[PDB]
């Protein structure tokens, strides 16, 4: 049950004035594509706070990648879901190397020890009972990253992927999907909506567990058949999101590499960006 | 559980090419606004057929309005949810005046007798147990109308309203919301997203029952206080959808009066239109 919104004063949306005329803001299956200018964050914050929403953020920091945790977490504190309930889940082979980072109120961090050495992340996420009890949504991101700007409840939805920053302008034949019919991740050259990056996906706990289960099972079949998809779990993520359309798509504002790709006119904000390695 | 979509060949959506540049296609709370060119109906039909979706359509034909049923139903057969399961619910004081209309396969019609003589429609819809058992979505429309073009699963969502054809270009101060603070339907001049028409709303059975219950209760409070909102149940519908944002908004393609308003450039299709009375 969703209670009433309070009175709010904000600019009237105008039917004959698009927010953005330079980009596609809705997919052909009527999922929003999230760009700056498409959302009133005050309205969304109200809606999600009225549901007392809890967001889980999973991040893997295995072997040398523990060095990325300090900047990742400190910048997450500045920019990720501020004002909402957040539970970070840090999967690592080195629990003692996790930096002591000061958290804002309503935010917690759990260290989950794992084995070191593409199958690990999808298998590890598909924690099943814990996430169902503790959070409403799961967001699954790369650690070799930093938040530079707002990443908030505008992303939340049953299932989302993120446009790969290298391929948002590419035609589908150029996408680096797995192209061998012998792989479970196979997508032919005449199929595909978008190329999603493995570094930022999420959704409700239920939908994220479905996706990660399916990708894990598909990767196991491939392993048994002696094939490894060209881009590993990303290849399977793309296969999954082709056959199970996401209910929102994040623009490349949400996954950018400024060193590689600069700052194009189409990006009004760079929100979550690659750290040099 | 949603099974996989089959392989499909369709045009690739392009991130740097908007479908429509002339209209707002997503609200500031990230609900799609449904216009022609925003959706691939083949994808949506697949998604909704894979869930074996059943759509209930409610229509009231009381007193002289029974005369509108023949054209309403015959044109619904040509254009409304064709290929999907449909259950029409015709509420009338004259069961014997309901025309015998031939239905396509998978479609059924129930005649529900009611009393003759704004409270009736919201009260009557909030049938509660029957709809929950028989349909997935409810669509609630005026009878003095005809379908001229496709109205399909693109509209389905937990909660939707439709932009009133007279007001989609209007600023909010000009909207004919109820303006007296003594009414439950009161909306001040600095609030409001859109002006929704009472003639086409819907959603999941649960959300439609919530809306109709709330509007019925609000109208009862008004009656007890000796006030009747300026546009009756439409005034309350607008209050409800202000405080409970719809998850899709239908463009005026879905509710048009060609005699009054012609055929503006912004409408690529006229789907569901007023019959002269
Ligand atoms: O030694 C490692 C390697 C990786 N990671 C974790 O795995 C994440 C992903 O690894 P990278 O950042 O090195 O790789 P990309 O994000 O470039 O991932 C893409 O390239 C990969 C192969 O390099 C796979 O194909 C993957 O599916 C695809 O999304 C890292 O952020 C980190 O969280 C570790 O913790 N330790
Ligand atoms: O004698 C009647 C009158 C109305 N109706 C039913 O009620 C529907 C709505 O009535 P109208 O078509 O006459 O009115 P509008 O659609 O123009 O409705 C708008 O104007 C109404 C007052 O005229 C209310 O304010 C209502 O909330 C607002 O949406 C009709 O389609 C019909 O289904 C009947 O069956 N018999
Ligand atoms: C010559 C150097 C490597 C830089 C060129 C990489 C450009 C394409 O990005 C890569 O795309 C792959 C799928 O085709 C896969 O997702 C890995 C991805 O590379 C990662 O993401 C990029 C945006 C960069 O941050 C890159 O460094 C990172 O490895
Ligand atoms: C002088 C004649 C009446 C025609 C002028 C009506 C224009 C405005 O439409 C009316 O708007 C009201 C809210 O302000 C309320 O929704 C009723 C609505 O009138 C109905 O819908 C219109 C689009 C027409 O189909 C109209 O005939 C119908 O009554
Ligand atoms: Mn990375
Ligand atoms: Mn009418």
Curated annotation (Swiss-Prot), chains A, B:
Q: What is the effect of changing residue 154 to D?
A: In allele B106
Q: What is its main location?
A: Golgi
**Positions annotated as glycosylated:** 52
Which key words tag this protein in UniProt?
Answer: Blood group antigen, Glycoprotein, Glycosyltransferase, Golgi apparatus, Manganese, Membrane, Metal-binding, Secreted, Signal-anchor, Transferase, Transmembrane, Transmembrane helix
How this chain sits in the membrane, per its record, is: Single-pass type II membrane protein
One GO biological process this protein is involved in is: protein glycosylation
Q: Where is the active site?
A: 234 (nucleophile)
Tell me what this protein is called: Histo-blood group ABO system transferase
User: What is this organism's lineage?
Assistant: Eukaryota, Metazoa, Chordata, Craniata, Vertebrata
Part of the full-length chain shown? 64 to 346 of 354
